[PDB]
Design a protein around this ligand. Sequence first.
Ligand SMILES: C[C@@H]1O[C@@H](O[C@@H]2[C@@H](O[C@H]3O[C@H](CO)[C@H](O)[C@H](O)[C@H]3O)[C@@H](O)[C@@H](CO)O[C@@H]2O)[C@@H](O)[C@H](O)[C@@H]1O
Ligand SMILES: C[C@@H]1O[C@@H](O[C@@H]2[C@@H](O[C@H]3O[C@H](CO)[C@H](O)[C@H](O)[C@H]3O)[C@@H](O)[C@@H](CO)O[C@@H]2O)[C@@H](O)[C@H](O)[C@@H]1O
Ligand SMILES: C[C@@H]1O[C@@H](O[C@@H]2[C@@H](O[C@H]3O[C@H](CO)[C@H](O)[C@H](O)[C@H]3O)[C@@H](O)[C@@H](CO)O[C@@H]2O)[C@@H](O)[C@H](O)[C@@H]1O
Ligand SMILES: C[C@@H]1O[C@@H](O[C@@H]2[C@@H](O[C@H]3O[C@H](CO)[C@H](O)[C@H](O)[C@H]3O)[C@@H](O)[C@@H](CO)O[C@@H]2O)[C@@H](O)[C@H](O)[C@@H]1O
Ligand SMILES: C[C@@H]1O[C@@H](O[C@@H]2[C@@H](O[C@H]3O[C@H](CO)[C@H](O)[C@H](O)[C@H]3O)[C@@H](O)[C@@H](CO)O[C@H]2O)[C@@H](O)[C@H](O)[C@@H]1O
Ligand SMILES: C[C@@H]1O[C@@H](O[C@@H]2[C@@H](O[C@H]3O[C@H](CO)[C@H](O)[C@H](O)[C@H]3O)[C@@H](O)[C@@H](CO)O[C@H]2O)[C@@H](O)[C@H](O)[C@@H]1O
Ligand code: CA
Ligand code: CA
Ligand code: CA
Ligand code: CA
Ligand code: MN
Ligand code: MN
Ligand code: NA
Ligand code: NA
Lengths: 292, 292
Amino acid sequence: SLRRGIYHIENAGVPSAIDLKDGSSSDGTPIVGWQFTPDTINWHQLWLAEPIPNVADTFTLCNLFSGTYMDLYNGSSEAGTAVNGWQGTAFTTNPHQLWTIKKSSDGTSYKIQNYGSKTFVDLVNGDSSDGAKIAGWTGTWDEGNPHQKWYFNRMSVSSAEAQAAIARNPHIHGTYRGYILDGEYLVLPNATFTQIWKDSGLPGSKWREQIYDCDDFAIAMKAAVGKWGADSWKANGFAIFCGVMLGVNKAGDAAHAYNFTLTKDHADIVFFEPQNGGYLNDIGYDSYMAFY
Amino acid sequence: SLRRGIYHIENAGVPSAIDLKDGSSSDGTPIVGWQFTPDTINWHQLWLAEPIPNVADTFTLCNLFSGTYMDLYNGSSEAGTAVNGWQGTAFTTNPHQLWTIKKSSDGTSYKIQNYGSKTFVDLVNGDSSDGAKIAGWTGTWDEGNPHQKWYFNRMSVSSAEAQAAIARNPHIHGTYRGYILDGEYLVLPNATFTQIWKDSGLPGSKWREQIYDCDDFAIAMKAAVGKWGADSWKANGFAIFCGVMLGVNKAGDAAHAYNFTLTKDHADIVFFEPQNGGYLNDIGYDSYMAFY
Ligand SMILES: C[C@@H]1O[C@@H](O[C@@H]2[C@@H](O[C@H]3O[C@H](CO)[C@H](O)[C@H](O)[C@H]3O)[C@@H](O)[C@@H](CO)O[C@@H]2O)[C@@H](O)[C@H](O)[C@@H]1O
Ligand SMILES: C[C@@H]1O[C@@H](O[C@@H]2[C@@H](O[C@H]3O[C@H](CO)[C@H](O)[C@H](O)[C@H]3O)[C@@H](O)[C@@H](CO)O[C@@H]2O)[C@@H](O)[C@H](O)[C@@H]1O
Ligand SMILES: C[C@@H]1O[C@@H](O[C@@H]2[C@@H](O[C@H]3O[C@H](CO)[C@H](O)[C@H](O)[C@H]3O)[C@@H](O)[C@@H](CO)O[C@@H]2O)[C@@H](O)[C@H](O)[C@@H]1O
Ligand SMILES: C[C@@H]1O[C@@H](O[C@@H]2[C@@H](O[C@H]3O[C@H](CO)[C@H](O)[C@H](O)[C@H]3O)[C@@H](O)[C@@H](CO)O[C@@H]2O)[C@@H](O)[C@H](O)[C@@H]1O
Ligand SMILES: C[C@@H]1O[C@@H](O[C@@H]2[C@@H](O[C@H]3O[C@H](CO)[C@H](O)[C@H](O)[C@H]3O)[C@@H](O)[C@@H](CO)O[C@H]2O)[C@@H](O)[C@H](O)[C@@H]1O
Ligand SMILES: C[C@@H]1O[C@@H](O[C@@H]2[C@@H](O[C@H]3O[C@H](CO)[C@H](O)[C@H](O)[C@H]3O)[C@@H](O)[C@@H](CO)O[C@H]2O)[C@@H](O)[C@H](O)[C@@H]1O
Ligand SMILES: [Ca+2]
Ligand SMILES: [Ca+2]
Ligand SMILES: [Ca+2]
Ligand SMILES: [Ca+2]
Ligand SMILES: [Mn+2]
Ligand SMILES: [Mn+2]
Ligand code: NA
Ligand code: NA
């Protein structure tokens, strides 16, 4: 089954993602095919899949930016029926906004079926143009038709996945304790993580003994990523990944506070130095505490 | 011995505090007697006492606001010699800026002796006027003269003192771990703690599932108090007290993130709810983790 989380949904035939046009919150905003840039935030192209309890493999799909839901217009089963953003709720009973999502016949891409109509999300004609129509269309679960096949490129980690990335790391102290704050996290590209650091004003901050030292930099960076999350996205039910760690050096006679993020493959953590914006695989300390 | 820390230094005879006039960083800024308001930040009247290693009961006194040092003008032993703010360093060898501070004959107030001159800090004539001269003056360690007696009203806690206040509290979970970030903390009046909360913009923030929920409010409040410390004070070598706690309810089926501060007497903690600005002796959770 597709896991709860945030997805960049990319057509299997052409490099077009499912895009809520101009990120508009208006009811009936077209959802279209649009080109995308890897290792960026694709602002109009992120979808929070929320599993419906007791209805197998069936989800709402909420646009992270707009906070509006992928909606089959009037739930029509006619081929070519508009797929739009529409106001709704994460556990709606409105079948216009319920989507059964299961693996295609290629075992890697998915098909997206409207729960009400039993028609499929279709990039009409496989058109690769920016703003190409996406519609509900007749189809089958088993057929090869790439118009109706969608890679769910996973952009978020569970707290369990983040816990596993930390536990893999070779710089964890024997006394380590980790404190988990949320359930599902958007993983940022380093380019975005860096931009939030810059926009916080931290690059201008001076180290001062106790009054603005390592712990102040690390906590300011976590607060800044928190603020950016709330200020940037209209959807609820996820957080932004940014960790704080306290570490101790090999000699056991010096400690340091810093941040950490996750690799592109979500398998490992990377240390971030909020005093200079560096990324490091080894920051010269082993973590004895994290909160994220 | 006087402990390292931040002091409001109040004359034993009249209610005048040692005040760096207009908080000016200029060399030769007069240090004067001035009236004060209890349970406020007295912005020009806070002094960081830094013990000199291997010189018994002898300190620098750094004005928290200006970052300049209490200085006996040209180290003169003549009665009536000016006491001013002057540029210096926490462990200076300049005897103009070194002060032997020991209990008076009343066992409660201190006398402040210049290490070089062996003359005492004197509120000239016991004048209670705002802007009354303070000078180096002839005296003895044992005499009752209240012109030369000073209550060192302690405004800061050590990390040890903060650890003891938490451990007293009846709402600490059996699994509690505390993570200490600094060494010496200015304790805020609730009136100031509240003002920093207001000035952060947190009173306007909405609770949103995961994306701005309890942990975001608590960490935003700690970041805001950190920022306020660095932006407000020019001295180094202390921090501002503001804790984050994670707690669990009695049933063990709900958790919450919040802040805590310290009572006026520095003996106990008080919980702060950053979602509404409330202070509570019981927030309905027992802490399993703190960082401060
Ligand atoms: C059958 C129909 O279902 C609901 O209407 C839907 C629309 O529903 C969604 O938007 C409306 C406001 O337009 C409302 O907020 C509702 O809670 C939300 O789920 C929407 O799916 C459109 C576009 O496909 O179709 C229908 O108009 C309901 O509001 C109607 O009363 C009616 O029962
Ligand atoms: C290239 C083309 O692929 C297939 O046609 C698709 C359409 O496919 C879907 O709809 C048709 C009926 O219109 C049928 O129900 C099929 O099972 C279903 O997958 C559809 O994707 C449209 C809109 O994008 O494009 C093409 O017409 C195939 O059926 C055709 O023979 C042809 O090979
Ligand atoms: C004996 C004298 O000591 C120092 O001068 C002090 C002053 O010292 C302080 O301020 C000066 C700059 O004016 C400098 O920054 C120094 O490091 C600092 O400790 C000051 O205490 C004044 C007022 O009482 O008296 C003397 O001028 C030193 O700089 C001189 O060279 C000289 O050795
Ligand atoms: C009321 C007054 O108190 C004392 O005099 C103080 C001064 O006291 C200090 O200086 C004198 C010499 O001027 C002497 O060395 C004394 O031991 C020392 O404490 C001084 O505080 C000034 C400036 O504020 O005010 C008074 O003159 C006492 O000696 C007087 O007899 C008289 O009772
Ligand atoms: C917020 C906005 O994002 C970008 O524009 C979007 C656009 O973004 C996608 O397509 C562009 C090329 O047009 C790039 O491939 C991006 O990497 C994609 O994410 C689309 O989402 C359309 C349709 O909804 O809306 C635009 O606003 C960017 O070009 C803008 O400067 C701006 O940052
Ligand atoms: C920063 C400034 O603080 C206050 O003025 C100070 C003044 O403060 C003390 O004296 C006033 C009465 O003049 C009150 O008792 C305060 O509680 C004291 O802290 C002195 O420090 C003088 C001399 O250095 O400087 C003034 O700036 C306050 O009145 C101002 O509004 C302002 O907040
Ligand atoms: Ca949370
Ligand atoms: Ca600090
Ligand atoms: Ca520190
Ligand atoms: Ca959160
Ligand atoms: Mn290591
Ligand atoms: Mn309790
Ligand atoms: Na389900
Ligand atoms: Na000493």
